[PDB]
């Protein structure tokens, strides 16, 4: 493969059309911008989502729901379905499982919020071989599937939240059964 | 990264040469050499299709006179009653051509038509 001999495949590259060089090119003169008007004039031009004085669609419509204050956050716990977990990459059944094992396996990868996710096991999907999961709270349907499977499952307590002593004492007082 | 040109001089010498014997500024003065060029090509079209049309005309009138030479009222009209009734495959107004070269032949044609 000498330097001279090498060539690129066909259709790999398209020469950019240069507007205004000639009439034969066809973009010459007006350049397809037509005659006059705001679009024809050089400049930033009319703003997008602008209706030329009519109320824009965004303006007429009320902002969705609960707009002002809202967590507007979904993800809490990364969710990996059983079909995805049992199927595809398959655990030895000797292996521990959990988030650390999963990342290594490559079935599930958490990058933006590794810290925020605790993981969850979805009810959906069926697992052929029983396995032990040290992951935190799972869906009841999903929890049921593992139990039917008979694979050992263990809930994991991720963290403890500090509470005021007076409040804590109050809870103890309730302990009326 | 200046990229200046000379391809105009050839672009334009070529025309400058196609417009020779144009008798005015139409042969020297480039910015009009161009539009002249355009207009010579255009009249080449119109004079070409009109030359087909024009030579028919010329032969119709020429054959027409040769036929009217018979002193009785014949025509280029009636000569063609009688030249298609008798099957002659279209001497193609080029009987108008021998009519001036071999006139005796065209009198032979004409007599066979009259029969």
């Amino acid at each position: 493969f000498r330097l001279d001999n090498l060539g690129p495949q066909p259709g790999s590259r398209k020469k950019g059309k240069r507007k205004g060089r000639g009439h034969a090119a066809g973009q010459g003169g007006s350049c397809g911008f037509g005659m006059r008007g705001q679009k024809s004039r050089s400049g930033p031009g009319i703003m997008r989502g602008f209706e030329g004085g009519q109320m824009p669609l965004y303006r007429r419509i009320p902002k969705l729901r609960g707009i002002a204050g809202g967590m507007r956050a979904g993800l809490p716990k990364y969710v990996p379905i059983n079909l995805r977990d049992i199927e595809v990459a398959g655990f030895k059944e000797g292996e521990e499982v959990s988030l650390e094992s999963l990342k290594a396996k490559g079935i599930i990868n958490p990058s933006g919020r590794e810290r925020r996710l605790p993981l969850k096991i979805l009810g959906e999907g069926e697992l052929s071989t029983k396995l032990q999961i040290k992951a935190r709270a799972f869906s009841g349907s999903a929890k049921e599937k593992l139990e039917a499977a008979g694979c050992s499952v263990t809930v994991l307590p991720g963290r403890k939240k500090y509470i005021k002593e007076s409040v804590r004492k109050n809870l103890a007082r309730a302990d009326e059964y | 990264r200046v990229k200046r040109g000379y391809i105009a001089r050839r672009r334009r010498k070529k025309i400058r040469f196609f417009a020779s014997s144009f008798r005015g500024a139409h042969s020297r003065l480039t910015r009009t050499i161009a539009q002249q060029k355009i207009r010579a090509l255009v009249s080449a079209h119109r004079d070409r299709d009109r030359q087909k049309r024009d030579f028919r005309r010329l032969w119709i009138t020429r054959i027409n006179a040769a036929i009217r030479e018979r002193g009785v009222y014949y025509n280029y009209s009636k000569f063609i009653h009688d030249l298609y009734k008798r099957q002659l495959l279209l001497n193609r107004k080029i009987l108008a051509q021998i009519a001036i070269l071999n006139p005796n032949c065209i009198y032979m044609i004409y007599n066979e038509i009259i029969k």
């Binding site: 493969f1 000498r2 330097l3 090498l6 060539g7 690129p8 495949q9 790999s12 | 990264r1």
Partner: protein, 210 residues
């Protein structure tokens, strides 16, 4: 693929050292290796091409004469692009091109280049060098007795590149020594006369599989 005999200083045929390298699918080789070259030497360039716009040129910003009441065009500065005093429209200013080419593709441009140069009388191959008092005569004579000398650009490389061959390889313009650290797509892409050593034949084989 195809094997190839090892040479020596004397120039005989010890050894086998079969070389196998991963290659692009046929009909995709040119696009794969061409694009790799063109990112190579497109990336290499350097901007170093500047100019001045209507705003930097030193000409002033005085409206040279009033708008109307004069019979003459509406010229609006003598620093304007139209006037031949300066002010270029859309001149070149230092742009910094760079073409991220996917590693696993770039590799494959090498493997294709190499794997295409071998087996057609374009890969002689050695095993070592012992030069002392580096002298560019024993070395060029080595090329002579060795493979193809003819000073016809004969890319040529080695492993760990002992100084006393670096130091006698530079005088000869046609062939330039290479190391894995210094490997480039360009110069191993003559497929003309490129040599190897066993450290390169297995190091090479090791880097690329099938």
């Amino acid at each position: 693929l195809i094997p190839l005999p090892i040479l020596n200083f004397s120039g005989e045929k010890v050894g086998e050292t079969f070389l196998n390298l991963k290659t692009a699918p046929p009909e995709k080789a040119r696009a794969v290796v061409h694009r790799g070259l063109i990112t190579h030497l497109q990336n290499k360039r350097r901007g170093t091409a500047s100019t001045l716009t209507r705003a930097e040129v030193r000409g002033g910003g005085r409206k040279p004469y009033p708008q109307k009441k004069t019979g003459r065009a509406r010229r609006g500065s003598q620093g304007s692009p139209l006037r031949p005093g300066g002010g270029v429209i859309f001149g070149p200013k230092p742009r910094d091109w760079t073409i991220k080419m996917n590693k696993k593709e770039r590799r494959l441009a090498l493997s294709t280049a190499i794997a295409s140069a071998v087996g057609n009388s374009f890969v002689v191959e050695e095993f070592a060098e012992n030069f002392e008092k580096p002298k560019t005569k024993d070395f060029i004579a080595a090329m002579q007795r060795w493979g193809l000398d003819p000073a016809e650009k004969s890319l040529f490389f080695l492993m760990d590149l002992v100084e006393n061959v670096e130091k006698s390889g530079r005088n000869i313009r046609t062939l330039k020594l290479l190391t894995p650290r210094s490997l480039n797509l360009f110069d191993v892409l003559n497929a003309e006369k490129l040599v190897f050593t066993e450290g390169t034949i297995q190091y090479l084989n090791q880097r690329y599989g099938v």
